[PDB]
Amino acid sequence: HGSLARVGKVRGQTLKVAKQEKKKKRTGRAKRRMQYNRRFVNVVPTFGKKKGPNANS
Amino acid sequence: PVARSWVCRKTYVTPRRPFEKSRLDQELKLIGEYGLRNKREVWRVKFTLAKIRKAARELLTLDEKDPRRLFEGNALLRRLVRIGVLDEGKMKLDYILGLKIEDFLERRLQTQVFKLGLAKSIHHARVLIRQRHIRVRKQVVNIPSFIVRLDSQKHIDFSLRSPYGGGRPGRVKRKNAKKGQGGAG
Amino acid sequence: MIYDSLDYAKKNEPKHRLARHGLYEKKKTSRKQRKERKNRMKKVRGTAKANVGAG
Amino acid sequence: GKCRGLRTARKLRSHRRDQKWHDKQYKKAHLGTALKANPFGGASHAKGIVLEKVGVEAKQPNSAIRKCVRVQLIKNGKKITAFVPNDGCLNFIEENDEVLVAGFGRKGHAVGDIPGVRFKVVKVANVSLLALYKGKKERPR
RNA sequence: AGUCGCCGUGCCUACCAUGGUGACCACGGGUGACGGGGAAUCAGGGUUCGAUUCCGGAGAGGGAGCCUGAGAAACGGCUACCACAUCCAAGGAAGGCAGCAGGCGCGCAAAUUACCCACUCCCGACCCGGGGAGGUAGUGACGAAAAAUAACAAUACAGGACUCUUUCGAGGCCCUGUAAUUGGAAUGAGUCCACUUUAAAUCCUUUAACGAGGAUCCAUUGGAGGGCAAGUCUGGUGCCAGCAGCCGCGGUAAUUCCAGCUCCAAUAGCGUAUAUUAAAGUUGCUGCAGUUAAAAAGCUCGUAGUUGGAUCUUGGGAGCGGG
Ligand SMILES: [Mg+2]
Ligand SMILES: [Mg+2]
Ligand SMILES: [Mg+2]
Ligand SMILES: [Mg+2]
Ligand SMILES: [Mg+2]
Ligand SMILES: [Mg+2]
Ligand SMILES: [Mg+2]
Ligand SMILES: [Mg+2]
Ligand SMILES: [Mg+2]
Ligand SMILES: [Mg+2]
Ligand SMILES: [Mg+2]
Ligand SMILES: [Mg+2]
Ligand SMILES: [Mg+2]
Ligand SMILES: [Mg+2]
Ligand SMILES: [Mg+2]
Ligand SMILES: [Mg+2]
Ligand SMILES: [Mg+2]
Ligand SMILES: [Mg+2]
Ligand SMILES: [Mg+2]
Ligand SMILES: [Mg+2]
């Protein structure tokens, strides 16, 4: 039935980009400290515009 | 047929609404303050507290002048005063309902060694406890969640077999003095 | 536990404790070998110095 | 209104009994008709054999081809259609490959824009198709 | 009235009588039916499971009949028929793993032909002998408890709370983070002596000699339109490939596809499928509804069932204790 020739078109039609290395991130208990000292007091700008933690602009 | 036990219960409970944005702050707040690794450790304390709070809620529903109540009610007070959360001068069984999570977190060991000097940036405190540098009246402890009684808060110090508390230095400092004497020099 | 005499010991004492010290000795045949033979000796009847031979 | 006496229990208990069968879920479960007619014998998964590979068309507002397969079972002998979720993965399947199938998530009901499919393939040749997609493994040639 | 039976009884035999059960559900049929103590969920009331370590019952390939014995219709006792099945010199003989290990098949689906009678208990002619009952190691992310994967002090300032400052900016109480591993300290994972434990061994614990520079002793599973916590970033594709529990996305500027940075949640665990509880006051005793949304028999009588008016010794006292 139909035309099955065109399976895996896009997943084979895309280029092969490679990845990078940056670091390993802290794991376990230290990571929770990062979030605390980052979010609730790091530098505290009073006005946030209700802006998010990944808003790229 | 075997000689085994099979007895086991759980010690925590998950909430019903996973993403709420109002408690995630409180949870993560408690962590950075009292220095924990997971949400799970918090969830344990609420489970202890609810059950205390459950039982006392039932004794109140019983009448007064009932021997069960006069047995268990006087007994429960006695533990929380022993543990040092609840305070003498009030033993009424209705001041138990006004209890919070923070009282049972302050009463762990990690905090007391910190409030009692000795720790210097509380995350240090946990590392010391797990590195086996500390004792309680005779014995070393390798556990942060050890609830400390009130009878036994005047007897905490470094274990005796540590570099800190009167003992032999460690793997590094024992091979740098080696350099001062016969290695580098 | 302390005993009054060395002879009272092996009167009332477990053997495995005794053999800790070089005092008692124990025979060994692995107990699979042993009962294997025990299920033998039942296919031959009565013959004394045969069953003493154990085939 | 309601009966509401002090010694009415036989009536009420009875009334709830014969009147509970008019609920769809209870009726489905406690009668064997859905059960003996289910291709799976009250079970989650099942192995079976491939015998065709076809493409099913979709509903109106969408337009595509969803790359399903005709599959025969080992124990029962019945026949069914099944779906292969991912991009480019039908090519990973040969003829007569002894696959493992499962449900989709709606407990006998059709899902989405596919007209009459309620099974998805999971494992071909015992090497965990999802892992095979990600390149954590290859097939046992 | 008797026979048989360890004893009572239509349990059986002869002679008489015609009775016994039933809408308060007999009878018949189904059960993914061994029963119970109990298990999960649970405001209060309930719904579902219970083969599974304790008690009781039943069975030892399917059926029947027996010997011994205080006790068995035994099955690791016998004898026959059926189904299966091993030797064989072709005349004949031997068999029952739903006992411990192991194997074949079956299927979505389930461990070692290991060591010991040292513990617990049993049996015997017995302080002495036997026990795949039982203990002990092995496989084991069914599941449950504790708890690692970095800590610190100088170097700077993005900056902040404060002393000072018409601004920067000086003390830095105090903080964070990114780069320099700048700097030395502390630890165990991991090798390997020794002892202890053990029936004999292992593991735990105790303790000598080694043992970290953060390119390494490297934390994953899932997602980022909404429900629902988190990118209107970049390249490719063009109603094709594909996503999507539901609504929906894709027809050349895709917040949803294929990929890269970035971020979010749980964390040594996380996803997926299927049953089953709460949510379900969407099976309602507690506690729904019935004009038009699904819904009150066309009307009346009527047996079982359920439900049924008012009424018969009240005070006043007596021995007392309080405001
Ligand atoms: Mg068993
Ligand atoms: Mg059955
Ligand atoms: Mg049972
Ligand atoms: Mg029997
Ligand atoms: Mg059999
Ligand atoms: Mg028999
Ligand atoms: Mg038997
Ligand atoms: Mg047998
Ligand atoms: Mg077996
Ligand atoms: Mg399994
Ligand atoms: Mg666990
Ligand atoms: Mg993406
Ligand atoms: Mg979402
Ligand atoms: Mg339900
Ligand atoms: Mg409710
Ligand atoms: Mg309704
Ligand atoms: Mg429904
Ligand atoms: Mg109500
Ligand atoms: Mg109508
Ligand atoms: Mg009346």
XYZ file of N, CA, C and O in Angstrom, chain A residues 1-12, chain D residues 53-55 57 65 67 87-91 133:
96
model
N 0.831 -1.198 0.000
C 0.000 0.000 0.000
C 0.866 1.248 0.000
O 1.926 1.278 0.623
N 0.405 2.278 -0.700
C 1.073 3.562 -0.656
C 2.476 3.506 -1.231
O 2.817 2.653 -2.058
N 3.303 4.437 -0.771
C 4.666 4.627 -1.260
C 5.596 4.611 -0.054
O 5.734 5.617 0.648
N 6.228 3.468 0.179
C 7.121 3.274 1.311
C 8.572 3.596 0.998
O 9.430 3.425 1.869
N 8.870 4.069 -0.212
C 10.256 4.310 -0.593
C 10.903 5.386 0.263
O 12.127 5.391 0.433
N 10.104 6.286 0.826
C 10.590 7.550 1.356
C 10.684 7.539 2.873
O 10.527 8.579 3.516
N 10.945 6.371 3.452
C 11.207 6.257 4.878
C 12.543 6.900 5.209
O 13.473 6.912 4.393
N 12.642 7.438 6.421
C 13.886 7.990 6.912
C 14.463 9.068 6.038
O 15.685 9.221 5.978
N 13.609 9.791 5.320
C 14.062 10.881 4.473
C 14.857 11.895 5.281
O 16.078 11.997 5.143
N 14.191 12.582 6.203
C 14.802 13.725 6.861
C 15.924 13.290 7.783
O 16.953 13.963 7.889
N 15.758 12.164 8.464
C 16.781 11.763 9.416
C 18.058 11.319 8.723
O 19.104 11.235 9.375
N 17.997 11.045 7.427
C 19.168 10.792 6.620
C 19.553 11.985 5.778
O 20.684 12.073 5.291
N 4.008 -5.798 5.250
C 4.311 -4.433 5.663
C 3.520 -3.485 4.778
O 3.743 -3.435 3.566
N 2.612 -2.726 5.385
C 1.689 -1.866 4.665
C 1.746 -0.465 5.257
O 2.370 -0.222 6.288
N 1.077 0.458 4.580
C 0.994 1.836 5.008
C -0.442 2.277 5.142
O -1.219 2.181 4.190
N -3.414 5.052 5.886
C -3.710 6.461 5.744
C -4.382 6.998 6.995
O -4.909 6.251 7.819
N 1.141 8.866 5.977
C 1.181 7.415 5.879
C 1.958 6.910 7.082
O 3.085 7.353 7.320
N 2.845 3.640 8.311
C 3.894 2.608 8.307
C 3.660 1.527 9.368
O 4.368 1.431 10.368
N 11.290 7.900 13.356
C 11.662 8.307 12.006
C 12.694 7.345 11.436
O 13.791 7.210 11.986
N 12.353 6.686 10.333
C 13.306 5.881 9.601
C 13.463 4.459 10.077
O 14.418 3.788 9.666
N 12.551 3.967 10.907
C 12.756 2.714 11.612
C 12.117 1.506 10.949
O 12.412 0.380 11.355
N 11.245 1.694 9.965
C 10.693 0.539 9.273
C 11.774 -0.230 8.538
O 11.651 -1.442 8.341
N 12.839 0.453 8.131
C 13.905 -0.213 7.409
C 14.661 -1.188 8.291
O 15.314 -2.099 7.775
N 17.740 2.581 17.656
C 17.592 3.892 17.035
C 18.706 4.823 17.478
O 19.386 5.445 16.656
